[PDB]
Amino acid sequence: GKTRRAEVAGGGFAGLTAAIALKQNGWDVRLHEKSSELRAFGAGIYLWHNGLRVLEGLGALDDVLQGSHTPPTYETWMHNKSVSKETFNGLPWRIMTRSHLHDALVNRARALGVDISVNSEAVAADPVGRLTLQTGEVLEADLIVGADGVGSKVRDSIGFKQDRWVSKDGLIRLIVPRMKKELGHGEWDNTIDMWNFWPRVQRILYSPCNENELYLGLMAPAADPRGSSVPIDLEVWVEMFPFLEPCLIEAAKLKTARYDKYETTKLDSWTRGKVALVGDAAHAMCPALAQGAGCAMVNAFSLSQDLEEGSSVEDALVAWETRIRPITDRCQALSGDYAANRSLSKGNMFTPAALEAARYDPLRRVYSWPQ
Amino acid sequence: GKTRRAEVAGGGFAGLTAAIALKQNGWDVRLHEKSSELRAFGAGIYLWHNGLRVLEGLGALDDVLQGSHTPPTYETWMHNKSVSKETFNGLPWRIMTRSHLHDALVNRARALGVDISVNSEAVAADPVGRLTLQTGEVLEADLIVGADGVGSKVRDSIGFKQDRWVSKDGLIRLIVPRMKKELGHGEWDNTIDMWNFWPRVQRILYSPCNENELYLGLMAPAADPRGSSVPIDLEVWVEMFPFLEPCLIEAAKLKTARYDKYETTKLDSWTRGKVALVGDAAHAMCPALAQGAGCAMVNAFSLSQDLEEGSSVEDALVAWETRIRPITDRCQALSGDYAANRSLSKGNMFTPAALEAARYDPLRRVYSWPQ
Amino acid sequence: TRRAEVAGGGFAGLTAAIALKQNGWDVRLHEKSSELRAFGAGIYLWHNGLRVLEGLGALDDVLQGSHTPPTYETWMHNKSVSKETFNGLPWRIMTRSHLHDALVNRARALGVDISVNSEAVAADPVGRLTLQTGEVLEADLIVGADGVGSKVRDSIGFKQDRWVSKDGLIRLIVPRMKKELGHGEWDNTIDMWNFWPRVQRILYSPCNENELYLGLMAPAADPRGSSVPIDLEVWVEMFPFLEPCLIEAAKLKTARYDKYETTKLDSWTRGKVALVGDAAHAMCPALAQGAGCAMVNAFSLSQDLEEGSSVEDALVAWETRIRPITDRCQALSGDYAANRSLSKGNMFTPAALEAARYDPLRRVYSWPQ
Amino acid sequence: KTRRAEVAGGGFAGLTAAIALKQNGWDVRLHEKSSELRAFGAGIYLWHNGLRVLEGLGALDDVLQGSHTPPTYETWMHNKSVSKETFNGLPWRIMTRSHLHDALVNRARALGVDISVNSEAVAADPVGRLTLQTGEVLEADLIVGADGVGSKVRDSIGFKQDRWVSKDGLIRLIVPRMKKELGHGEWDNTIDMWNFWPRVQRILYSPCNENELYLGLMAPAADPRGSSVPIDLEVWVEMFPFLEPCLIEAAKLKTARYDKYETTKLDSWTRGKVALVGDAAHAMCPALAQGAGCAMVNAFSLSQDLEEGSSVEDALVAWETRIRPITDRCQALSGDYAANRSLSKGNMFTPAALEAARYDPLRRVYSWPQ
């Protein structure tokens, strides 16, 4: 009395974004992270205008921009031949390690006074406003946020209709030193998406995060016993990416690299009663448009906006989904099409349609940076 | 009544910005333009993050972004050799025709209900809150804004201490078709600053505004009777910029081109009683950093911010100048140094110091996009 | 006066006829087809072949109207993987008819007797050549220069290892369309390799300001790539930067898909019979030395016949002196073909260039690598 | 009946004449004024014409081994590449001068040419007499004045000439390639690097082989820094920073010289039994890189005309008539290029510029058409 209370399950980008945005609006917010430490996995990440605008709204933009990188261009190669160079007509974008982004959100959530619990796993949620932890402890609140990832127990304990999919193939994602000097002549501040189908299917997404750190995604079929191996098989990667040898040598030193498969989900509904699902829990998607976390953050931020309208929580949640979900649905669908067709291999695929989610400004609720 | 009243002298970028920002804050605003038509001269213009943020604050950003251009890179040439390519670490920037920008500000000021008078010339202002027109008509107001350009009569009728300066050399600025196809192979969406000292001092700043329009600045010494001639001496320009021949041919058709010299002013004070000087009236500068209008817009917008603090107008004006002027002073000084030393000819000159003004966010009052 | 009968009016036969005639031989040459003509569109010659032409007095007629690219470039999947200029070693590209005309005109100026529609059907080491008219000709020397299907060779019975590939290529002369090709380095040789999305290759070879020589290589089991007249779409699809030239190529109704063919013989001579060119040593074309070696060998035969020996002895000395250069070139070129080595670029090594470096006039290797 | 020739001068022209004469059964003695056989000027370009002479001298393969043909002849103006030329296959070659000189000396020695160092011709007589600085008077059927632009064979006789020296010059050096240190680029190319701004400074960059680089540093004599020897490292690195590793080695060369350009044109190349060849007769501006080329073609051609059964006197007249217009035209065009700085524009090796290079002295025809 009379403070609205929110329990947030999940300490990833969506959960942290929701917790900050609610807390800024005067909610009493508690956040539960299942693992032993607040931490992001996946090495590196791209954000665009939409996600950057969310960060502005969270008061964490400038902490993220300091120590992250915008390449001079987004370049695509096919068999070492440059097939496209894209700068998106000025649309802002940024590459950073996941921990850089995650640290900035943690720092902000903590500074705002978000109640943070780790080793705290949500195992059940009730639409009347109850969150049950693995300890058996039952929490009552006016709002429950399921931001607990693609394997969401908040979602599955309630039983939402879904269409869930797991990929055949996967990739290895790593942070290594830039080795820029050792790379010699070239445009080594660029994003370079290096595709190959001959002599083998192997791809590297080359992604500078700053002056010190390079984010690499190494993509090879699961049925390729060498290309999919971790720690990496140096020989098969150097063979097809010899110009990256200095960085690949450093990558081969990382004993805890993982080969991860892609996973998606689409839900009929994102809400039930006082429970809202946000992020991968609601809309895990293919990463072709690099909008999974971007949409997760736009959605979590937009949830806080609809909760300011004076409505009941239940009504605000229905209004939220109705307003914001089509942007995500369209983005998820197009990114799935790109993934299935290997569209990015052709270059020049960041079309106006592809950049729709990136152009969205969640703060002013309009589309900006026209294409 | 209790409705604060502002009289704004000058219908340029500074005047229009001040009128919009004040009107949005509930001022009763009247704007006076000396000439017979609201219109901008000078062909094309660059804005950066700081000015784009002002546009966001004026509710005119997206009208400007639609139909303007961000080059993939800002390139510098010396004797046809590329000596630098700069993308400013993601810092937003934009090139556009002056009429594109000016139309967007006029549409917005008009839409908001600003009282617009043309053929209305301010010839005297009084710090107690009086503006006199050339008609002899005397207007009383709570705030007087001198946005009447480098030859400000609002300023000179009051007698501000100044250090005024006029260049010996100048340039011809024009809008022509892109002729992109005709330019053949190259990077013709780039900004390209093409310097030459041999065989003659001639420079062209090549600045695409959109798919249809190209902004060209043709710089030659005033003592050069061919290079400084208007309409342009096609031969002496084609001779040193042969790759631009299709565009230069179009430029030669422009009968109303002008050769304009540069002009600067620096004032000990920007305010006196209820009178505030904004834009070129207060701080006309060398255009090396392309920040003259950017600073003018930031200062005009920031004026409206300080007027929301519940102070007397007089105190608010003093607080405004104290808060905002050092950014402009430093920018003016550095741009003057660059101009005197021809620093831009070396390339790579958009350093962190050069970009200080561009990095400023007038909305949040912090510096963004670190360099 | 010594008499020679030469079977075959290709590069090897014409070279032999001219070289012998210059040395005072009385020479008649027999061409099986009804007109003197060279097939195969375009051809590369190197230092060795150019030196032969100098020795034949036909160099300048060949250099006028032929082309040396600024560089020999190799692409893999449109990526430039090498540019080679061979440390100044001279080389030249030309239409086959240009080279063939220069040789025919020289032979005619010298008084070589040429009979078209005259086929050698049998030969005898004692010095007899039988024509398809049944006429038996007697001579001090018989030159079997009658190509890979040599009847001079097969009527005598030379032990050989003869081979034909299942795959082949289409060779055409088209206009340069240089302006329509827009920006690039369109005076270069460009060997444009691809294995993905399909196995298709174009050897791009400018012959002069007007004529471009193209070799379009696709497997026989590819019904589109191997089709004649060309399936325009499948070629434009993988070589879109060549569309103006391919459009012209598509108009060529008489285009052929020719298979590769090689032979290696234990012996090149039998009594007064000498086999030269494809009759003796047809090879894979990777090193572009088939005619080069043929011409060096035919020219060298005339040299050994000036030593005062019996023809029989001179022929043995000729083979002993000159064949290892050809054997090594043939073996390396076959290795390159089998391993698709040219696809890697930078493959014109000192070893690859051995034949090209040979100067048949001074009998030394020049242009070191 | 053994014909006898005395050749004054042991540079490219003298050695070429001596070899060619000797090959044709002349008894040949050659006199070199300096105390040792040696070529100065660091490096040198030869073209088809000069390479053909070497073939005719039986010295081609010794020259080709250890010399270099660039992939392309490139020109820069203010660091911008303005042309790349390969001359439609026309053979050319860059080498150190000592490499060329050594091949010629070794060949003359193998043929039995009698060479006297520290032997200066101080006077000549058209009747066939050569006077040495020992006062010895030599008699011969042919006297070859191959004694350079300051020819005493020429001046003792008195040939009408127009001789000229420039105020400006250049520094020519051989340095290591430092190819790895040069990093990314096309460092096997010839690169003629022109600048007029901020200062008039030019470097002709000329690789001779895997180990040696030939540099020509051209600055006006009135520039006390650019014309300084040993080189003012700073002013060269300033305008050619991409060549710093090579220039650092260049700065170590204490015996560097600033040499001035010299030309001469004579109304006549012959007098009685005396023939003037090379710089003695036709020193020219170096734009077309044909000074030694022409000298060698002319020296080789002289031996050809002496094989016709004429008197030496008649053969010399026929020689000059046959061969001089190629040299006259080359010299005139080269001087025009030098005066107009034409090479700075690129693409200047036109058919006309390449006329001398295209000439084949062995078959007496023009080859490699342009």
Ligand SMILES: Cc1cc2nc3c(=O)[nH]c(=O)nc-3n(C[C@H](O)[C@H](O)[C@H](O)COP(=O)(O)OP(=O)(O)OC[C@H]3O[C@@H](n4cnc5c(N)ncnc54)[C@H](O)[C@@H]3O)c2cc1C
């Ligand atoms: C290969 C790949 C590349 C990608 N690249 C990009 C990109 O460049 N840009 C971009 O925007 N997106 C990208 N994405 C997508 C992005 O990773 C996801 O959309 C994003 O991380 C989703 O965040 P989230 O907070 O919803 O889920 P998660 O990041 O999975 O976080 C949920 C948090 O859930 C905690 N948790 C789980 N279960 C419980 C529980 N029961 N109780 C309490 N806590 C729990 C998890 O441990 C964790 O701390 C990429 C994805 C993949 C697979």
Ligand SMILES: Cc1cc2nc3c(=O)[nH]c(=O)nc-3n(C[C@H](O)[C@H](O)[C@H](O)COP(=O)(O)OP(=O)(O)OC[C@H]3O[C@@H](n4cnc5c(N)ncnc54)[C@H](O)[C@@H]3O)c2cc1C
């Ligand atoms: C060559 C050059 C290039 C430049 N490029 C850029 C650039 O790329 N980016 C950038 O941000 N800046 C640039 N600038 C600077 C920019 O042009 C100015 O700073 C800007 O236009 C100043 O706007 P203002 O409204 O203060 O003045 P002005 O634009 O001069 O406008 C004042 C308005 O004053 C009206 N007026 C005048 N007198 C009276 C009066 N007595 N009563 C009523 N109205 C009056 C004038 O007619 C006009 O309508 C450049 C300047 C130059 C010279």
Ligand SMILES: Cc1cc2nc3c(=O)[nH]c(=O)nc-3n(C[C@H](O)[C@H](O)[C@H](O)COP(=O)(O)OP(=O)(O)OC[C@H]3O[C@@H](n4cnc5c(N)ncnc54)[C@H](O)[C@@H]3O)c2cc1C
């Ligand atoms: C695809 C391909 C590309 C090649 N590219 C090059 C290249 O770039 N450079 C190069 O040097 N080589 C190249 N070659 C090889 C070159 O084509 C041959 O080595 C050369 O043509 C052999 O010439 P020849 O005179 O021995 O035989 P052929 O050219 O076959 O000529 C023999 C002549 O034989 C006449 N004839 C045949 N039978 C009789 C008979 N019974 N009686 C009388 N006359 C007869 C034939 O009709 C014809 O006129 C290439 C070969 C191929 C297949």
Ligand SMILES: Cc1cc2nc3c(=O)[nH]c(=O)nc-3n(C[C@H](O)[C@H](O)[C@H](O)COP(=O)(O)OP(=O)(O)OC[C@H]3O[C@@H](n4cnc5c(N)ncnc54)[C@H](O)[C@@H]3O)c2cc1C
């Ligand atoms: C800067 C520059 C660059 C050049 N680059 C090229 C180039 O790239 N390619 C090219 O072909 N040419 C080039 N040349 C021109 C070339 O150097 C000359 O044309 C060539 O060296 C002339 O040779 P020569 O034998 O006539 O004279 P020299 O080389 O001058 O030789 C005469 C020889 O004369 C000996 N001697 C002198 N006086 C007497 C005497 N009285 N008695 C006996 N011996 C005497 C001299 O000491 C010496 O040993 C260049 C010239 C210059 C200036």
